[PDB]
Amino acid sequence: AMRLWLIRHGETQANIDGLYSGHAPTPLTARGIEQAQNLHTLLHGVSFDLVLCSELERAQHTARLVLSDRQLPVQIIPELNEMFFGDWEMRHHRDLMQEDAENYSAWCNDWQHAIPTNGEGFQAFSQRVERFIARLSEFQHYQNILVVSHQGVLSLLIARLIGMPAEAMWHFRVDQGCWSAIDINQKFATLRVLNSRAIGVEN
Amino acid sequence: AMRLWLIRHGETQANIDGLYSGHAPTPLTARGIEQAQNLHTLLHGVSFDLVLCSELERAQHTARLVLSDRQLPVQIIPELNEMFFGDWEMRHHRDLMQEDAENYSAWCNDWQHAIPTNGEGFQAFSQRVERFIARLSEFQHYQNILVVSHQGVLSLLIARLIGMPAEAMWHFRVDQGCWSAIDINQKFATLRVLNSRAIGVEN
Ligand SMILES: [Cl-]
Ligand SMILES: [Cl-]
Ligand SMILES: [Cl-]
């Protein structure tokens, strides 16, 4: 009886500027901060047993805002980090087609196998998220787990938990300022909530 | 750019008694009516141009309550009907195990191939929902479609739209009193919301 409460970090400056966000630092905007504050209200009644957060500061900043009233052991997991884009970090799609046309166009036509320049390909990234899924049995005695991460990770986590290939991650888009939930009972994952802005209740 | 707003009908007396509820009539309770009235408040700002509904009066009753203010002709689609349970309609699992032991035991163990007594099996039920997916192109010029149906249909619809086998329908459970949304862009289906109790806004 394990419920994973999925949370994507708030809106960042890189989102407003339409840049690639990977391991590079970018701060939460004023709206992204208030999104995490509203989530603190919407999940105030949930008694989490553990917080799982990415190494990136914008994720940890969100986790702190959702748990302002409270105090709870937070665990920092590098497998929850967004895909590493290498030389493409904090750069726009229009500029990459002119400054790195050869590699970037191959990425646009076959993102599953083309590797971003000096970055992390999709195969290695999906293996890293798969490593986190195999690691969830370590938390078998926690009932409610809060997971603060990024859209590429959370969409892939949903896809693989309920048995789809990694390439099907884009059938699920998780949004900022919302929360999602997935239940795992006897290694069977059930998507219960996806992108809710309502008050969450334990069950 | 098609968005299907999915709504399962509210709580019924059959739900209160824990009975198999398929094609047999069963009324909304006072709570099930209140669920549809709250959904009317949640979706007040969504400009539906079409409402798809099953033949069951309890689903049409829900659609009328969700759209009390608006005027919008309800299209009655028998493919959106719940699975037909035949002689098992409006009966309890505790009683069916004794009175129809051989057939009901087979259904509990091989539910994807065993036929409910004088009912419709899961193969014919999945083909029927598949038939509904095939004629979705008839609604290509509508943008916000309200789909009022039942849990078996809506779970199977989501699973098949994003490319999963019919038997994976139980990785998604559509709850009562909530709304879900799936977007279809160039024959690619995206699950955007699953069982929300928050205010909905159209894309
Ligand atoms: Cl950051
Ligand atoms: Cl029902
Ligand atoms: Cl009815």
Side-chain angles (χ1 to χ4, degrees), chain A residues 1-70 72-203, chain B residues 1-68 70 72-203:
Chain A
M2 184 170 68
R3 172 165 263 209
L4 274 36
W5 302 73
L6 312 190
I7 290 284
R8 175 186 175 184
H9 66 83
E11 182 196 65
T12 66
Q13 253 304 322
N15 297 147
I16 285 187
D17 293 319
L19 316 169
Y20 277 82
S21 267
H23 291 195
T26 168
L28 292 177
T29 64
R31 171 178 185 182
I33 285 159
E34 102 167 297
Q35 285 171 333
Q37 291 178 315
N38 180 31
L39 278 172
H40 160 264
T41 298
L42 292 176
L43 292 185
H44 189 215
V46 181
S47 315
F48 299 101
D49 306 330
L50 168 79
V51 186
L52 299 189
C53 199
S54 165
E55 287 183 312
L56 308 182
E57 162 66 21
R58 60 192 185 266
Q60 305 193 19
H61 190 186
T62 296
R64 278 191 300 272
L65 288 160
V66 189
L67 323 171
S68 55
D69 300 340
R70 317 140 81 139
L72 182 35
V74 187
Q75 205 166 134
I76 284 72
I77 290 91
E79 289 88 88
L80 292 183
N81 293 343
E82 183 67 281
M83 176 195 271
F84 178 43
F85 293 107
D87 286 4
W88 298 351
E89 292 263 12
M90 300 300 278
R91 293 171 72 186
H92 198 264
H93 155 84
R94 262 103 211 179
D95 311 328
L96 276 172
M97 269 190 309
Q98 286 184 86
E99 302 152 8
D100 205 357
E102 34 272 39
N103 282 307
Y104 186 66
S105 290
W107 154 266
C108 286
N109 291 307
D110 207 17
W111 53 272
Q112 308 180 12
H113 304 106
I115 286 89
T117 306
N118 303 133
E120 182 180 20
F122 181 73
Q123 303 298 85
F125 168 69
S126 66
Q127 284 163 7
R128 164 157 64 82
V129 166
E130 195 82 3
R131 248 172 281 123
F132 170 82
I133 294 179
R135 267 230 289 131
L136 281 167
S137 49
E138 306 179 347
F139 305 111
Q140 56 190 251
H141 297 144
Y142 301 78
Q143 323 275 304
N144 282 287
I145 307 170
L146 180 63
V147 182
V148 192
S149 185
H150 316 266
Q151 191 207 12
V153 170
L154 298 175
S155 294
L156 178 49
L157 172 65
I158 295 168
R160 291 264 66 220
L161 267 176
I162 55 187
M164 260 154 303
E167 311 85 51
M169 56 176 283
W170 289 125
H171 286 294
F172 314 96
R173 284 158 52 193
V174 313
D175 299 333
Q176 306 169 313
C178 322
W179 59 272
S180 296
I182 182 148
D183 288 351
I184 301 144
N185 299 276
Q186 293 146 85
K187 298 326 184 216
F188 185 89
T190 300
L191 190 58
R192 301 292 292 116
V193 174
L194 183 68
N195 289 318
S196 171
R197 298 186 125 88
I199 291 135
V201 193
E202 292 211 359
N203 217 294
Chain B
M2 196 168 85
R3 168 163 274 201
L4 306 178
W5 305 76
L6 313 184
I7 291 283
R8 173 188 180 189
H9 70 74
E11 169 210 72
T12 69
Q13 263 302 321
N15 292 138
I16 290 293
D17 302 336
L19 311 174
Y20 283 80
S21 197
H23 287 215
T26 179
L28 270 49
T29 68
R31 180 174 185 259
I33 291 181
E34 192 196 20
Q35 283 168 331
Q37 292 167 329
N38 180 248
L39 276 167
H40 165 83
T41 310
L42 295 183
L43 306 178
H44 198 264
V46 181
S47 289
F48 305 103
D49 37 29
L50 181 56
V51 174
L52 280 35
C53 189
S54 81
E55 299 195 298
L56 281 308
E57 190 64 44
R58 64 180 173 273
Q60 303 182 39
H61 187 183
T62 291
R64 289 191 300 268
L65 285 176
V66 176
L67 298 139
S68 60
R70 334 181 211 241
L72 207 59
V74 189
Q75 214 154 306
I76 307 301
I77 316 299
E79 282 70 36
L80 291 180
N81 285 7
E82 189 61 295
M83 187 167 65
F84 181 38
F85 292 104
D87 289 358
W88 298 354
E89 294 263 2
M90 299 302 287
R91 297 168 71 188
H92 198 272
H93 166 91
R94 151 131 180 77
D95 302 315
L96 288 159
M97 261 299 189
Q98 312 254 61
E99 306 145 352
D100 204 358
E102 196 182 359
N103 308 283
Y104 189 73
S105 209
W107 154 262
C108 293
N109 299 285
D110 196 27
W111 61 268
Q112 318 162 47
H113 306 106
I115 312 283
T117 308
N118 310 111
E120 96 171 316
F122 179 70
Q123 296 299 318
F125 168 68
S126 61
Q127 296 159 21
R128 173 159 67 79
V129 170
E130 219 62 33
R131 237 175 288 126
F132 169 80
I133 292 167
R135 44 87 57 98
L136 280 183
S137 284
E138 300 187 358
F139 313 118
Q140 64 187 74
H141 295 136
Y142 303 81
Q143 284 127 67
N144 292 286
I145 306 179
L146 181 64
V147 188
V148 195
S149 192
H150 313 256
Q151 198 197 19
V153 174
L154 296 180
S155 284
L156 185 51
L157 180 70
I158 299 173
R160 296 293 302 120
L161 275 171
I162 67 186
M164 256 180 305
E167 319 77 273
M169 57 176 293
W170 296 125
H171 285 286
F172 321 92
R173 277 165 39 198
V174 181
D175 300 338
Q176 300 181 319
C178 315
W179 61 270
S180 304
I182 171 157
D183 295 351
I184 304 179
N185 300 284
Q186 311 183 226
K187 303 316 196 84
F188 183 95
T190 319
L191 184 66
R192 306 287 294 111
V193 178
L194 178 64
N195 302 138
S196 181
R197 294 178 180 272
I199 308 291
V201 52
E202 62 208 291
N203 46 323

